[PDB]
Amino acid sequence: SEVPLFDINALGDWTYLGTSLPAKFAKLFASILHCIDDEYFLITPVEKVRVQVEDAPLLIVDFERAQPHSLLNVSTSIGTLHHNVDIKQMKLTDDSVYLPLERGLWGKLGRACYYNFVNEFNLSDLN
Ligand code: NA
């Protein structure tokens, strides 16, 4: 065990060595976060380290289509922004809905945007 030094809880909040990271620090580290074969890492040339993730690495708190019927832009609780997000590729558990983002990362839909997400569906999203 490399016990991971970075932890992301189910609500998307990060710690390092057990200390809470401010959102902007979580956003800095998220820029180099990947999920490879179901395991999470921060990846740089010199340092490649593990991250423990309770649920999803990112919590989606807002979304919009760039244009009618387009793919989605989403933003997260730590302030990251993601483009070209495809409703058709969503994944459900019995508890939550997840959307696929870059670098193998999935974003969990936050409770406060759930109903708005359901309302957003267009039949064209299945095309
Ligand atoms: Na709709």
Residue numbers in the entry: 29 to 155
From the manuscript:
The Sbal_2486 gene of Shewanella baltica OS155, a psychrotropic marine γ-proteobacterium, encodes a protein with a molecular weight of 17.7 kDa (residues 1–157) and a calculated iso­electric point of 4.8. The final model included a monomer of 127 residues, seven ethylene glycol molecules, one sodium ion and 231 water molecules in the asymmetric unit. No electron density was observed for residues Gly0 (which remained at the N-­terminus after cleavage of the purification tag), Gln9–Cys28 and Glu156–Gln157. The two domains of Sbal_2486 (residues 29–84 and 85–155) show close structural similarity to SPO0140 (Cα r.m.s.d. of 2.8 Å over 127 residues with a sequence identity of 25%). Sbal_2486 crystallized with one monomer in the asymmetric unit and PISA again suggested a monomer as the most probable oligomeric form. However, the results of anSEC coupled with static light scattering (SLS) for Sbal_2486 indicate a dimeric form in solution under the test conditions. This suggests that either the observed crystal-packing interface is stable or the oligomerization state is dependent on the buffer conditions, forming a dimer in the anSEC buffer but disassociating in the crystallization solution prior to crystal formation.
To extend the structural coverage of proteins with uncharacterized biological function, we targeted Pfam protein family Pfam06938 (DUF1285), for which we determined the structures of two representative members. The first structural representatives of the DUF1285 family revealed a novel fold consisting of repeated motifs. The conservation of the domain interface indicates a potential binding site that is likely to involve a nucleotide-based ligand, with genome-context and gene-fusion analyses additionally supporting a role for this family in signal transduction, possibly during oxidative stress.
